[PDB]
């Protein structure tokens, strides 16, 4: 099944933050309504934040996270979790190699902000 795609409420600000746990440089693309709205690139084996930004979900609310290393898309896992019917987390893990730790880039999307 498709992973890394989330429908947010329309016209809503959200945070997106990416962490890296891999020898490879991670490239994280964040699309809103099928167009790139943010791109993070970095390398860390220690969960360093390689990027954090505030975006707007726009008229469609469609947000997609893509992760690649050296042109090779990583295998994504994702889910959305809502706490007290209000606080939303859209979560992505990714595997760029052979060990299936799925942490090579970790992406956290959170809303509402403010």
């Amino acid at each position: 099944a498709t992973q890394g795609v989330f429908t947010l409420p329309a016209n809503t600000r959200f945070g997106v933050t990416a962490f890296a746990n891999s020898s490879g440089t991670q490239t994280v693309n964040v699309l809103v309504n099928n167009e790139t709205a943010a791109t993070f690139s970095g390398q860390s084996t220690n969960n360093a934040v390689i990027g954090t930004q505030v975006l707007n979900s726009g008229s469609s609310g469609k947000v997609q996270v893509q992760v690649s290393v050296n042109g090779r898309p990583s295998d994504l896992v994702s889910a959305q979790v809502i706490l007290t019917n209000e606080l939303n987390f859209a979560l992505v893990g990714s595997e760029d190699g052979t060990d299936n730790d799925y942490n090579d880039a970790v992406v956290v999307i959170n809303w509402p902000l403010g």
């Binding site: 020898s23 490879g24 050296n70 190699g97 052979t98």
Partner: peptide, 6 residues
């Protein structure tokens, strides 16, 4: 790690 072995 990017390497033939990996």
């Amino acid at each position: 790690k990017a390497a033939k072995a990996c």
